[PDB]
Amino acid sequence: MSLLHTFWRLPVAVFFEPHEENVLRCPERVLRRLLEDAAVTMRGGD
């Protein structure tokens, strides 16, 4: 909940091609898939 604190109180609609400026778009499905793949890589990692 609200784990990010932002200086601005309103967001803006960001235009232009992703090679102009950095934007963190990622839907939750992709994030969950990435998390489990990283888990299996860590398992793959006297």
Partner: protein, 140 residues
């Protein structure tokens, strides 16, 4: 003119005496106070009242339109505009009445038009001890 209603205090009167004296190229003069006989003349009264009315009407009217138009605004400027309006809010209608208030705002702005801008009528090119005169080109 705007200070004309607080003239019972000495702080305000010192403020007006500071407003009244003006300094320019090697000369100082005192402009006459628009308040004579303790009351402000009707033309200056209308100018001040129109200025205050346009300010007051903008303060309440602009937020409703800024929200809707900032939703669309590709300039991401109107979002910052709405943020500033939210800030000034934080520091402190029938459709025909909305039309009436918008009409009032624009009529008050037209009332300000005489003062808001003044025309240039000449531009100077001449220097002399005779400085009483100069040669200028006329502009309409």
């Amino acid at each position: 003119g705007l200070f004309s209603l607080d003239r019972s205090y000495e702080e305000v009167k010192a403020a007006v005496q500071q407003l009244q004296t003006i300094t320019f190229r090697d000369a100082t003069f005192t402009i006459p106070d628009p308040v004579i006989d303790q009351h402000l003349l009707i033309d200056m009264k209308t100018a001040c009242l129109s200025m205050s009315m346009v300010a007051n009407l903008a303060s309440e009217l602009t937020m409703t339109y800024v929200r809707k138009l900032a939703l669309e605004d590709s300039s991401m400027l109107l979002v910052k505009c709405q943020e500033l309006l939210m800030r000034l809010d934080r520091e402190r209608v029938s459709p025909d009445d909305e039309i009436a208030r918008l009409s009032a705002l624009f009529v008050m702005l037209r009332q300000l038009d005489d003062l808001i801008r003044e025309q240039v009528v000449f531009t100077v090119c001449d220097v002399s001890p005779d400085n009483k005169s100069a040669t200028c080109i006329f502009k309409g």
